[PDB]
């Protein structure tokens, strides 16, 4: 998908310590723009991107009401699920919910999704057609029949194919300078001798957006995947991302190795080499 | 923009 809007909900029961934790975040592609934290002081949906701050009072009252409705629904879900699995309210349990939509290059609906997990495991999920459910076990079959009787899928579909896409389009325009930008990776290479015979070549990619990127090492033009160390793409803390890849090369054979960077901001892939000196 | 509709598990 070209662009996406996603909402993430986490609910964590706290035995002996009061109300359950509830944390909700909304993303436009790889950019968080709203948050809600049950332990936060404001008890309102808060902005985390500059373009959503231009929204007026009714927007924020509406989002606050919707996220509090999700918060209170999750509070009931924790008890219901414990009832399904016969659990004695003495342990901490986790509920996670994720829904949203993707749009194509023409900003029109491509796919929608609604996922629900209990204790880090799939519980019930809306199928790609947005019409039926995939239930993971016998407890999810109870949820499925209830949601089928209440026509939950038909009403989630209207949001996922409709409202979700419409407000994604609005966000992409109002926040075009953040959301529609491409920051090509700033790339450099470092050299770290591990002995008199071997050395590590580390290929860097920094300050890039979006997070999707590919780093591959080649030797004589052949892929060296089974010998490349890759850290997962990590956030820099300022809206950009980082990544590096390293290979251990024999001292004297560094010129045989090349690092290739692929990114949306690069029209053609970049080739990096290590120049002794 | 969140969904105004939500149903219990």
């Amino acid at each position: 998908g070209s662009h996406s809007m996603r909402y993430f909900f986490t609910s964590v029961s706290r035995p002996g310590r009061g109300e359950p934790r509830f944390i909700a975040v909304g993303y436009v592609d790889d950019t968080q723009f709203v948050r809600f934290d049950s332990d936060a002081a404001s008890q309102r949906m808060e902005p985390r991107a500059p373009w959503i701050e231009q929204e007026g009072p009714e927007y924020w009252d509406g989002e606050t009401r919707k996220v509090k409705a999700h918060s209170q629904t999750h509070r009931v879900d924790l008890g219901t699920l414990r009832g399904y699995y016969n659990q004695s309210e003495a342990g901490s349990h986790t509920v996670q919910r994720m829904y949203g939509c993707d749009v194509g290059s023409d900003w029109r609906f491509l796919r929608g999704y609604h996922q629900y997990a209990y204790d880090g495991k799939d519980y019930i999920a809306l199928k790609e057609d947005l019409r039926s459910w995939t239930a993971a076990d016998m407890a999810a079959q109870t949820t499925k029949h209830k949601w089928e009787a209440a026509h939950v899928a038909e009403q989630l579909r209207a949001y996922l194919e409709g409202t979700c896409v419409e407000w994604l389009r609005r966000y992409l325009e109002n926040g075009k300078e953040t959301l529609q930008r491409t920051d090509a990776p700033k790339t450099h290479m470092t050299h770290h001798a591990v002995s008199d015979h071997e050395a590590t070549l580390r290929c860097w990619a920094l300050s890039f957006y979006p997070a999707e990127i590919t780093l591959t090492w080649q030797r004589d033009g052949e892929d060296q995947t089974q010998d490349t160390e890759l850290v997962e793409t990590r956030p820099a803390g300022d809206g950009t991302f980082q990544k590096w890849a390293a290979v251990v090369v024999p001292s004297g054979q560094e010129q045989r190795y090349t690092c290739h960077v692929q990114h949306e901001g690069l029209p053609k892939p970049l080739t990096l080499r290590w120049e002794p000196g | 923009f969140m969904n105004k509709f939500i149903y219990e598990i």
Partner: antibody
Framework: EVQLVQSGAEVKKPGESLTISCKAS????????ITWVRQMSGGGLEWMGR????????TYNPSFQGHVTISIDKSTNTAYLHWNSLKASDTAMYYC??????????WGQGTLVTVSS | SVLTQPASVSGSPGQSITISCTGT?????????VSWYQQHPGKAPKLMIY???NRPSEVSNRFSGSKSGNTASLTISGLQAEDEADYYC??????????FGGGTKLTVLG
């Protein structure tokens, strides 16, 4: 400030058709359904049904299912309540109301209909 | 009907009265979404208290709301003749629906 403005009172006879309307003045973010409520003389508030203005998805109360039809015109923000054939039991006050996320926050002024034979 | 209110309550002017609203664990005891509406004869319901104890700025601060378990309460302090009306409670149920109480006729003995 948004207000629901319903259509005038109706004086009807059994067997006739009827359609009462409810136009929401001003604009609101799509966070709400439009709900129709019946209040018979001296009675409580009976939830008849509701409709989503975005996709016209309609939920009815099982007691009113099939006897009345709720529709919407999102281009004019007008909700409709239609009886195919009035039965003289339908003599009551009818309110439209806005259900905003987790709350009925505004009410229409009411449309009294009187079905006498 | 789905929620249970007393059919009638009375009070003297200047005094305080309380109207109860009893539901189940799925509406009143399950959520903090209890609403209260005032209805004068011939007129539409008007929102007085929402979200258990919240109140619109235009509604007099003589009205307050509270909840405990499966029962919510509306309290009106310093009763005035204008407070004599019908009062209805409502609660959130799942599916973003609402259930109402039966209504309570308040009489202010003037």
């Amino acid at each position: 400030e948004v207000q629901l403005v319903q259509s005038g009172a109706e004086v009807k006879k059994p067997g006739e058709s009827l359609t009462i309307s409810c136009k929401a003045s001003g604009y609101s973010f799509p966070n709400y359904w439009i709900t129709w409520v019946r209040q018979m003389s001296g009675g409580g508030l009976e939830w008849m049904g509701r409709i989503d203005p975005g996709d016209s998805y309609t939920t009815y109360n099982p007691s009113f299912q099939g006897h009345v039809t709720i529709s919407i015109d999102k281009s004019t923000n007008t909700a409709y309540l239609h009886w195919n054939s009035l039965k003289a039991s339908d003599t009551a006050m009818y309110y439209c109301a806005r259900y905003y996320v987790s709350l009925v926050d505004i009410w229409g002024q009411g449309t009294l209909v009187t079905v006498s034979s | 009907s789905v929620l249970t209110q007393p059919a009638s309550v009375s009070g003297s002017p200047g005094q305080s009265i309380t109207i109860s609203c009893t539901g189940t664990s799925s509406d009143v005891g399950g959520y903090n979404y209890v609403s209260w509406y005032q209805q004068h004869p011939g007129k539409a319901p008007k929102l007085m208290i929402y979200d258990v104890n919240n109140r619109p700025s235009e509604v007099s601060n003589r009205f307050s709301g509270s909840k405990s378990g499966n029962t919510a309460s509306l309290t009106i302090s310093g009763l005035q003749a204008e407070d004599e009306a019908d009062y209805y409670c409502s609660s959130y149920t799942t599916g973003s629906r609402a259930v109402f109480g039966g209504g309570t006729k308040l009489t202010v003995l003037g």
